[PDB]
Each structure stands twice: as C-alpha cells, then as structure tokens.
Design a protein around this ligand. Structure first.
Ligand SMILES: Cc1cc2nc3c(=O)[nH]c(=O)nc-3n(C[C@H](O)[C@H](O)[C@H](O)COP(=O)(O)OP(=O)(O)OC[C@H]3O[C@@H](n4cnc5c(N)ncnc54)[C@H](O)[C@@H]3O)c2cc1C
Ligand SMILES: NC(=O)c1ccc[n+]([C@@H]2O[C@H](COP(=O)([O-])OP(=O)(O)OC[C@H]3O[C@@H](n4cnc5c(N)ncnc54)[C@H](O)[C@@H]3O)[C@@H](O)[C@H]2O)c1
Ligand SMILES: O=C(O)[C@H]1C[C@@H](O)CN1
Ligand SMILES: [Mg+2]
Length: 1214
C-alpha cells in the first residue's frame, strides 16, 4: 500500500540554482521586476539619440509607402457588409472546383437568394470583423450579417462577389499564410531570400486534443522538415530556412501535471524531429506558449541539448517571452545550458502572444500576481533589457530579435554596435506583416542586418483556427503596427524611449490601474479567496510536505453538542480510492442526542440572536482567514476522504472561503434589528462538496442569527468536523453550532424535532421530497410553514452547433462531464451535437476520453478519482450495463489494476437515440450524447426542459441568433455560454436551479440570507423599474370592480416586484457574468376569501407568473369578466396534480387550513414547491404577507467573451 502523497508531484529533475531563480520570479510584484530591467536596458545619450534617429527614419519610410479598405470604398460597403462579403467569399472558397464556384456565383448567388445554395456562412465573422474593422466582437450577429449580405448582393451583384472572392483568395492564400502547403510556401520564399531574408516555417499546429491529432501534427512537421531541408540544400542554419514547432501540438496532455508522460512520450517525438533537422542542418525552433508551460519546456530543452545523438548541430532554437517576469532568469538558464552543452542555442526573443489569456487565468485561479507584465511599456523595457543580456553572449547563443516595433528594433540595432557578421544575431518578423519594416533593414543599402520571416503554412481551416490571436499581436490599441497606421499618433510618440519613460514614472513598475490583482477582483465588497499554483515547483514541494503531514493526522468527527462531545457508535473512514488507507474515525449521533441538540439550540437561540449582525459577520470573516491559512492541510483531507483531485480540492476550499466572506458582506449590507432569526436551523449537506456546501449553508444560517444543527453526509464527516472546529475557533459559540455526524436517520430526527425552525438541504431530489413531506403538516409557533431550501439534482445538457470550435467544445465537455468523476451536481449529463459536426466531435471526444488518468487522487497526474462508495459504483454501473444491453454504443476507458483497492467507475460515453432514453440523474462519470438536426433546435430545448430538471446548462455557439433563441427558451438556473458548466463561483455565478433541481433562493446569491429570517431585508441592488403589464391590467380591472384597496395593493406589488432586474456581477476579465430575475412559472393559488385571492393574484402577476386557482375555493364569481390579458394567465384547478407542474404556491387560511393545504401540495407530483401562507387577517395587516422575493426565479448566465481567441476590452488596456 503506497504511502499517501509519497509520489504526489516530484519534479522532472532536481531544481538547480538557475532553475530556482526562474521559479522565484514567476509572480514577482511588478514594482520589483522593473528596476533591474531599467538598469540593464540603459544606453548612452549618444546611442539613444542615434536610435531615435534610426527609428524616425524607419517610421517615415513606413508611413511614406489596404485591399479590403479599397473594396469597401469601391462598393460603398458598410462594416457589416464588408464582413458579410468576406464570409461569403470564405464559403465560396470551400468549393474546391473553380468552374463550379464561378457557376454558382453567376447563376445562383448573384441573382438573389444566396441562402439556398449556402453551417452558417458567418462562423468566422469575428475574424473577418477584425480584418474589416480592426475591432473584435466575441460573438457574431448573424442576422445583421445575413441582412447586409442580401443588401450588398441586391445592390451590387456579381462584380462585388467576384472582388470579394479574389480578395479572400489572396488574403487566405498569400497573406495570412505564405502558402497552403510547405511546397507552395517554399516556392514563394525564393524572392525575399534573394534579397537577404531567411525563413522559419510555422505549420500552425497547436493544442492537440487526442493521440491521433498529435500524430497528425507530428507527421506534418516531419514532412515539412524534409521539404525545408531538401530546399535548404546545405545553406546551413543561418542563411537557410528552418521550422518552428509548438510542443502542445505534439502531445494531448502537455502539462506540468502530466510531466512524466511529457518526458516519456513527447520528448522522444521532439528528438526524432530534431534528429531529422540535424541531418539536413536546418533550424528547429520551439515556440513559446502559455506561462504554465514555460518551465516544463525547459526540461525538454535541457534533455535535448545534453543528448549526444544531436551533437554537431546548432539548429535547436527556443523562444523566450519578454512580457514574462521570468524572462531574464530563463535567459540566464539557457545561456548556461548553451555553455554546458556546447550547443549555440538559437534564442528567439519575442514579447508574447497570450497576454489577455494570462490575465484571465491568473484571476480565475486566485493567484498572488500575474506571470506577465500589465503595462505594455514594461514589456518593452523587459525586451530591451533581455536584448542586452543576449548581445553579451553571442559567442554561446544566437539571438533572434522578433519584433515589428521600429523603436525596439532601432534600440537593439545601435546596442549591438558596429561589428557584425552573418550568424552573430538576426532580427525576425511575421510574414505579410513585418516586410514593410524589414525591407528598410535588410541589404547592403539599408542597415545590412538579416531578418528571418516567420512563415505560416496551412489550409484555410488551419489558418482560421487561431487567426484572431495573431491579429491581436499587431492590432491592439497599444500595438506598434496599429499605432503607426493611426494618423493621430505622431512619429515623436512612436520613437519615445520606453526605458526613459519608465525611469521617470513616479512609481517604477506599477501595475496597470485598470487590471485587478486576483485578490482584488471584488474591490471593496470582499477579499477574493486565494488559490495555489500547481505549476510552481516551490508550491508543489511545499504542498507535498503539507499533504503528507495531513495524512499522518488522526482525524476524527464526534457529535459536538452544546454541552460537549457526546458518546456514540464509532467507525473508520476509508479513502474511496483505496480502502486500505484509513483517513480517520467518526462517532455518529444517536437519535436521542440529535433531538437533544435541537432543544439545546432552541435554548441557545436568544443568546446567539443578540450577537449583532456585524459581529456574526466578523466570525465568518475570521473563519475564512482560518480556512485560507489551513488550505494545504484541508486539501489533503478532502483528497483522501472525498476522493477529490488536488485542483478540485483547492477550488472547494476556495468556495468555502468565498461563502464565508460573501455571506459576511451580504449581512453587513442588510441585516438589522427587524430581521429576526427563524430559530434552530437544520443544515443537511451532501458528500460531494463536503466542505463548501456544508460551510455555505451553516454560515448563512449562523450569520442570519440562527443556531445551527449541522448534519454532514455520512460519507464525509471528517472535513465537516474540521469545518465546525474552524467556525468555533473563529468565535461561533458551541451552543450556536452543533455537529451531528451520521446517516439519514440523524437527518430525519433533526428535521422532525419540535423546535426545528427551518431546514437547509442540499442532496437528492428523492430525499428532499421526504423532508418536504415531514414538514408538510407542521407550522412555526406563528402558524406559518417551516422554511425549506432544497437544492437538488440535475440532468444538465450542453448544446453544440456547427459554429463552435471542436477543440474548445471537447475540452469543456471532458471537464464538465468527468471532473470529480462526474460527481458534481452541475456536471454535464447530456451532450447535444448538431448532426453535421457530431461525428467529428464524437471522434475527438472519445480520443480525449482515453487520455484521462484514473486512480487514487494523492497524485497530481490523476485526472479522475474514485466514486464515493461501492453502492454508488454499483448504481452507476447498473445504468451503463442497461444502456449497453439496449444496444447503445458505450465507450469506456480501461482502468488500471491498482483501482481494485477502491471504488472506481471509468469515464464513459453513451450514445443515445433520444433524450427520453434517460430517466433519472446518474451521479457518476457518464456522458450521454444525442444528435440533432439544426431545424429541430427548438424542439431539442423542449426535450431538455421536459426532464423537469433545471440546474446547469451549456451552449457552444458563435451565433447571436442561436444564443438569443436558446437562452430565452431554456429553463435552468445557471447558464454557461462557450465555456464549461461547472465550478460556479460564489457571488459571480450565484448557483441554484428550478423545477426538480431546486426551490431556491440560490446559494451564493443575494436572496439567500433573506430566507433565513422572519422578515426579509431588501438585498443589495434588488429592484426593478419595470412593471408587469398583466399586473397593471389586473389593477385597472380591480378599480373598475370597485375594489379600490386591492387595486392600490396591486399597484404597490407591481412597484415592489424586482421582476426584470438585470445586473452584471464583477468577476474576471474575459467573462460577462449576468444575474437576472424572471417569473417562476405557474403559481398555485389557494385562497380563502375574495380579498385574499386578489392579494394573491396581485403578488403572482406582479412577479410575471401565471396562476392556477383552487376551484374548491368557491371564489370563481370573484373573477368575472377579466381582461383577456389577465385571463390568459389564469386557470382554475380542481385537481391540482393534473394542472402542474407549479413553481410555487400562495395559501390563505387559518393554521389548520394551512396544514391541510400544505399536505395536499406536498403530495403533488414533481418539483418541491416553495409555499407561502398567510391568514386573512395577516393579508389585511401586512402588505408583505406574501414576500415577492420567493415569487421570482434567479437566473445566472456566464458568457466566455474571450472564446473567439482574444479579449476585446483588454485590447484597449496597455
Ligand atoms: C517572428 C516572430 C515569432 C514569434 N514567436 C512567438 C512565440 O513562439 N510565442 C509567443 O508568445 N509569441 C510569438 N511572437 C509574437 C510576439 O510575441 C508579439 O506578440 C508580436 O510579434 C507583437 O509584438 P511586437 O514587438 O511586434 O509589437 P509591439 O506592438 O511592440 O508589442 C506588442 C506586445 O506588447 C505586449 N503587450 C501588449 N499589451 C500589454 C500590456 N498591457 N502589458 C504588458 N504587455 C503588453 C504583448 O506581448 C504584445 O504582443 C512572434 C512574433 C514574431 C514576429
Ligand atoms: N442543487 C445543488 O446545489 C446540489 C449540490 C450538490 C449535490 N446535489 C445533489 O446531491 C446528490 C448527491 O449528494 P448525496 O448523495 O449526499 O445526496 P443524498 O440525498 O443521498 O443525502 C444528502 C444528505 O441527506 C441526508 N439524508 C438521507 N436521508 C435523509 C432523510 N430521510 N431525512 C433527512 N436527511 C436525509 C444524508 O445523510 C445527507 O446528509 C445528487 O443528487 C446531487 O445532484 C445538489
Ligand atoms: O460545482 C459547482 O458548480 C459549484 C456550485 C455547487 O454545485 C458547488 N460547487
Ligand atoms: Mg445519496
């Protein structure tokens, strides 16, 4: 039995002094990075003047000497017409045969309806939009483009189509790439090679998703090396052409977490390509990618440079990104490696291509700082400083200065001084972008310095995939290429010396004012939880020791009553991934002590209620500090007790921290003397978020002033006991927070206890129904239903159309379906693929499936851990075998023998014929796939809704029409656009569904605390200026009937309603997080009096709902001659169970009438109903007898606005 965490994340090799200096700089504060860079980049006044003159000369030549602009001019096109035309030209070029395409244009496209003859034409419109307008729009307004394309064709006809086709053909065949194939690219390189340029070919592969894709990219590189080396014909690595590769193209799991696979499987592939480059004597450059791959790539560079089979060849090259804080230390390492190995490493210095993605990632992960600079001028200074370091080592490395910035170029040109020979260093530029600058540089008549052209090679599909990222390299507001084209930017501004400008700033190296550090994402409201960087070797080494120590601890969970720990039946808690690994011991609670705990809570309630809200909130904030400090140890417990991976355990502790701080802030914003607590609240939680959901429910109840009985899932008591220990250390009194470990019998005893004043339940819908049933014939001392929050299961779907990028879809599907072994309530259960792309995406998905590592989760390399119990495993496997027995296609990963010691289910894909093939939530790593025809999209949304669930939902599309359609018709609480559907963030995606998935209000949202007091406060930002028009029609009807007091109450409800609230919540860049209040649906009304019915109807209509009124009320004559608009929303119901499902209920009557109705309502099939009751007298006395908070439904929508390949908002941030 392997020791826990003994092999958690050992590095590839012991970290040298040079390597550790790199790691130390990873997230170094920006003010600490700049001063040494300023010092290193400093040049003499003589040089700075000479560089400025050269820079001015180059820029004057650039401005002294486009196709799309001339096309827009000739045909008077609007921007949308220009984009639509380029999309049409792109589509026409998918027709391979020239005569056939020309015939379609002449006889069909020009004459009118282009729709019939021509997957949306506008799939790549965000890319063409950048081309036409210079502005990035993340999604495509396909109805605007369709309108513009019809308009331009009907106005201008075949000539404009011809011009569009020929322009797109030139751009996609000769500008965005040097050629479609390596042979074509080589043929076109002769012209500039004769003038003194060289080439490095970029085959455009990246981000392999499957073994087959990595193999395809490998064979493309290998074939390109042969063609380039044949053409080099002995010219060598400096004069002759070379190749560039991306390591992410050569393995589907290129990551630090998979370091062993990288060294074992990716490294031999690079070596084979390098051996071929060596034989032809051409350059082979390793391109630089995301920041979390930098240090891992160094391990490959080290092995290759030390491998004697590659000796005698100096063509190995490596990119370093000057926007990165580690850049100078990476160069120190590379220069030393060059000295040790005797290989003259070709070092391409670039600024960096992934800036906006690095900002978003660091924010999402809650890390200490960014791994890149946040001011563009800082990158410029870094670049020049690293250039000085490189130019001092030309005996051992070959510097390659890749830049389009004439100021940067001139600074390095004069820095390098007067001595030059071919092979000392070179500049580089991008094909079809940098030639105007570099034709002022290459040649005996210019600056006589060589330039290597980075030459993309590929088909239209290949080049379009990540063209947005490449357009942003030189197209952002701060980009030199964009600025030199802006006539409002002077040459003096262009030649400004970044080194001196930074030096003279008040705070050298200050972070950009408009970019929040991850900890400050929420500003003054609350402090963001902090994560851990699992790509940082220092972090991995520190975490390894803390995790090991956590496994040595003797974790226990005891029934912690107000008077102290109680005796009970004790048993061990076993690691689900290996039952030989005992994690701790739990003493479980007798039914007698559970009842005793509620009585003690009831006796403790006044003392806890008297602690002022700000001080209760202070306890929560102290608890969050404690959990943040204890995160490494907490991770170890979650990993071993709950079978979670390290990344998921980090996210879980972060969620708990966020709950504590969010409910603390919401309390400080709202709670006052008039918001009295309910009393003892029973909090019952599931095993699958054994810290986060456990803590969230308890913290909310406590901060609202209620003593809590905490009943954690029987599977996961230890982390719950540790959460309670932390809350108590933070100042929560023992009488206010009691822990009752045990099974559902303990939960049921707590619910049934006489003094229970409210229940918070997260778990299965079936169990929630039993709790609902026990509460049905029960009332508070004030004669109202006992509040129940019941947040339950999902049958979560994702819809993917033919405009989505397969690689993005597959990554989001694999994560959403199989993260945590599918044991998230938010997990993806049903993937719906548009028929035309289904086979290609399915192939990729199955390939990605087999790249997952399943095993005990005390290893960083494990992607999917065990399921929680043997019972769960048997349940999940029974479902799989039933599907397999029905003839459905089933794909499964094979499991390692080591999994036999625990309870594992292999990630599984099941192909279904119809969504009805599924019955209930299958809580495991089981993805179901259905296909749909595009015209059936609306029916498909019906099918998703028809399950009765409504928790999470995902949509992958670039098309605004499809977004508007699908999001308006789906009925789910958490929507996700162009991203995964998991990991909802507290206060950013308030989490919770409708129907069979929840009663609400949402955990992590602003309505939550108001459910836990007897008089709900007004939440922050909670209002709407919109008035429901059916409510207004009803108020006029009431006035016409003479019911003046009820008409006024109706108008008051119309104003008080927050229906229509529509807010954007603060969160990370590159995402828009929206929170809206909608109608719940159809509310069951059970009135007793005429006035009661009118008040109930006003409340329901003001919140946008329809109603079913109990026909047994005998009040039909009270609603004669309703306006048609109101009548459309009103039905009368004799058999309530026939006329559902409902989304809530309003009841009027005395205590025993409420009890009888509540019992009948609980017996209705389907969703748990949030019921509100009032007496006739309370309706007369209290305008808020029925609280409008619970008659609206919260919807959270998270849209990935960077999905197109970049962040438009951050293009303005430099
Ligand atoms: C031949 C060649 C090879 C390349 N290889 C790679 C590669 O392997 N890996 C890679 O990542 N990219 C690569 N690039 C791209 C390069 O990193 C730059 O993104 C791009 O060329 C623009 O930089 P610049 O010096 O041309 O222009 P500039 O306009 O001077 O510089 C623009 C750059 O400034 C940086 N920047 C912009 N805003 C900010 C900000 N707010 N804070 C901090 N920095 C900011 C970004 O890096 C941006 O690209 C390559 C470029 C060329 C020409
Ligand atoms: N909507 C959400 O936010 C959300 C979040 C996480 C999990 N879930 C759901 O939770 C389920 C998985 O978690 P689980 O297996 O722990 O759920 P579960 O229903 O089996 O148990 C949840 C808790 O209820 C208790 N319980 C069982 N019977 C009870 C009874 N008769 N009376 C009172 N308490 C009783 C259990 O001991 C446990 O503490 C899934 O269906 C998942 O979708 C929902
Ligand atoms: O996994 C998720 O989406 C978040 C919300 C809740 O389910 C707990 N974790
Ligand atoms: Mg269960």
């Amino acid at each position: 039995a392997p020791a826990p965490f003994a092999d958690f994340a050992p590095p590839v090799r012991p970290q040298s002094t040079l390597r550790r200096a790199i790691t130390a700089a990873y997230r170094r504060p920006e003010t600490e990075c700049l001063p040494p860079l300023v010092e290193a980049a400093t040049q003499s006044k003589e040089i700075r003047d000479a560089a400025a003159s050269t820079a001015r000369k180059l820029i004057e030549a650039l401005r002294g000497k486009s196709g799309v602009e001339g096309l827009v001019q000739e045909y008077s096109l609007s921007s949308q017409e220009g984009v639509a035309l380029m999309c049409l030209a792109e589509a026409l070029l998918r027709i391979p045969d020239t005569a056939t395409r020309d015939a379609l244009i002449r006889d069909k496209i020009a004459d009118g309806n282009w729709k019939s003859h021509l997957r949306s034409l506008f799939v790549n419109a965000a890319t063409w939009g950048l081309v036409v307008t210079g502005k990035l729009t993340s999604t495509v307004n396909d109805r605007s483009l369709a309108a513009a394309l019809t308009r331009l064709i009907s106005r201008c006809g075949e000539p404009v189509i011809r011009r569009g086709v020929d322009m797109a053909m030139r751009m996609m065949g000769e500008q965005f790439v040097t050629g479609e194939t390596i042979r074509e690219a080589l043929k076109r390189s002769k012209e500039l090679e004769e003038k003194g340029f060289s080439y490095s070919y970029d085959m455009l592969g990246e981000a392999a998703t499957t073994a087959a894709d990595a193999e395809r990219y490998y064979r493309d590189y290998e074939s390109a090396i042969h063609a380039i080396g044949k053409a080099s014909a002995g010219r060598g690595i400096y004069e002759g052409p070379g190749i560039s590769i991306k390591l992410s193209a050569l393995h589907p799991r290129y990551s630090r977490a998979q370091a062993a696979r990288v060294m074992g499987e990716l490294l031999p592939r690079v070596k084979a390509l390098a051996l071929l480059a060596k034989n032809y004597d051409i350059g082979l450059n390793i391109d630089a990618e995301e920041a979390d791959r930098l240090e891992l790539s160094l391990d490959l560079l080290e092995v290759l440079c030390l491998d004697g089979d590659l000796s005698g060849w100096n063509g190995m090259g490596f990119v370093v990104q000057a926007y990165g804080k580690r850049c100078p230390f990476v160069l120190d390492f590379i220069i030393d490696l060059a000295r040790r190995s005797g290989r003259r490493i070709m070092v391409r210095l670039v600024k960096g291509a992934y800036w906006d993605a690095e900002i978003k990632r660091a924010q999402l992960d809650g890390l200490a700082d960014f791994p890149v600079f946040t001011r563009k001028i800082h990158t410029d200074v870094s670049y020049i400083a690293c250039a000085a370091k490189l130019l001092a080592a030309t005996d051992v490395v070959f510097p390659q200065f890749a830049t389009h910035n004439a100021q940067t170029l001139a600074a390095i040109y004069h820095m390098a001084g007067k001595d030059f020979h071919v092979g000392k260093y070179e500049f580089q530029c991008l094909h079809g972008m940098g030639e105007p600058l570099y034709e002022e540089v290459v040649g005996r008549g210019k600056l006589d310095r060589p330039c290597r052209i980075y030459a993309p090679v590929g088909t239209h599909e290949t080049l379009l995939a990540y063209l947005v990222r490449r357009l942003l390299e030189n197209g952002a507001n701060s980009s030199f290429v964009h600025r030199i084209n802006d006539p409002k930017v002077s040459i003096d501004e262009l030649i400004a010396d970044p080194v001196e400008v930074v030096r003279a700033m008040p705070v050298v190296g200050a972070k950009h004012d408009r970019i929040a550090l991850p900890a400050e994402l929420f500003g003054d409201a609350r402090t963001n939880s902090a994560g851990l960087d699992l790509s940082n070797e220092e972090t991995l080494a520190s975490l390894t020791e803390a995790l090991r120590e956590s496994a040595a601890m003797k974790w226990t969970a005891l029934p912690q009553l107000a008077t102290g720990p109680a005796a009970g039946e004790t048993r061990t808690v076993l690691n689900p991934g290996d039952h030989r690994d005992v994690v701790g011991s739990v003493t479980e609670t007798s039914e007698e002590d559970a009842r005793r705990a509620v009585r003690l809570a009831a006796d403790a309630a006044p003392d806890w209620a008297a602690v002022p809200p700000s001080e209760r909130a202070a306890c929560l904030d102290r608890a969050a500090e404690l959990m943040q400090a204890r995160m490494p140890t907490l991770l170890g417990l979650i990993i071993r007790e709950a079978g979670k991976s390290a990344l998921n355990a980090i996210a879980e502790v972060r969620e708990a921290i966020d709950f504590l701080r969010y409910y603390a802030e919401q309390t400080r914003r709202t709670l006052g003397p008039g918001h009295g607590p309910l009393g003892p609240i029973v909090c019952i939680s599931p095993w699958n978020f054994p810290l986060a959901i456990f803590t969230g429910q308890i913290a909310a109840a406590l901060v609202a002033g209620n003593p809590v009985l905490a009943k954690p899932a029987e599977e996961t008591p230890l982390i719950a006991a540790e959460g309670v220990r932390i809350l108590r250390e933070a100042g929560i009194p023992a009488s206010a927070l009691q822990l009752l470990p045990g099974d559902g019998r303990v939960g049921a005893a707590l619910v049934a206890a006489a003094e229970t004043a409210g229940v918070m339940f997260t778990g299965s819908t079936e169990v929630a129904r039993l709790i609902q049933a026990q509460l049905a014939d029960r009332l508070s001392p004030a004669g109202r239903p006992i509040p129940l929050i019941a947040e339950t299961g999902g049958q979560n779907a994702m819809i993917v159309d033919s405009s989505a990028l397969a690689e993005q879809v597959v990554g989001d599907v694999i994560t959403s379906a199989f993260d945590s072994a599918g044991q998230r309530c938010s997990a993806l259960r049903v993937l719906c693929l548009q028929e035309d792309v289904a086979d290609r995406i399915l192939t990729m998905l199955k390939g990605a499936l087999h790249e997952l590592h399943i095993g005990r989760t005390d290893r960083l390399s494990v992607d999917v851990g065990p399921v929680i119990t043997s019972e769960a495993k048997d349940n999940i496997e029974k479902h799989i075998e039933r599907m397999r027995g029905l003839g459905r296609k089933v794909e499964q990963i094979g499991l390692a023998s080591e999994t036999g010691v625990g309870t594992f289910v292999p990630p599984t894909i099941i192909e279904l014929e119809k969504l009805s093939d599924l019955q209930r939530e299958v809580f495991g790593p089981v993805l179901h796939v259905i296909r749909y025809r595009r015209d059936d999209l609306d029916r498909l949304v019906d099918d998703v809704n028809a399950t009765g669930y409504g928790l999470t939902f995902g949509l992958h599309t670039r098309l605004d029409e499809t977004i508007a359609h699908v999001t308006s018709r789906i009925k789910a609480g958490n929507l996700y656009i162009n991203r995964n559907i998991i990991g909802a963030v507290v206060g950013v995606q308030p989490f919770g569904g409708r129907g069979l998935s929840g009663t609400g209000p949402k955990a992590g949202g602003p309505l939550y605390l108001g459910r836990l007091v007897t008089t709900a406060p007004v939440p922050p930002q909670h209002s709407s200026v919109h008035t429901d028009p059916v409510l207004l029609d009803f108020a006029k009807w009431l006035d016409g009937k003479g019911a003046r007091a009820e008409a006024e109450a109706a108008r008051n409800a119309g104003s008080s309603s927050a229906l229509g609230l529509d807010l954007e919540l603060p969160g990370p860049v590159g995402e828009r997080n929206l929170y809206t209040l909608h109608a719940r649906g159809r509310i069951l009304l059970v009135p007793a009096t005429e006035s009661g019915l009118y008040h109930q109807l006003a409340a329901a209509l003001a919140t946008g709902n329809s109603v079913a009124i109990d026909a047994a009320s005998g009040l039909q004559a009270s609603l004669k001659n309703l306006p048609q608009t109101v009548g459309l929303r009103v039905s009368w119901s004799k058999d309530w169970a026939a006329d559902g499902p409902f989304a809530g209920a309003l009841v009027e009557g005395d205590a025993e009438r409420i009890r009888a109705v509540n019992k009948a309502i609980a017996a209705l099939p389907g969703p748990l109903l949030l019921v509100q009751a009032a007496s006739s007298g309370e309706i007369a006395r209290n305008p808020d007898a029925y609280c409008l908070n619970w008659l609206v439904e919260e919807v959270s929508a998270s849209i990935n606005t960077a999905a197109a390949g970049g962040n438009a908002s951050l293009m303005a941030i430099g």
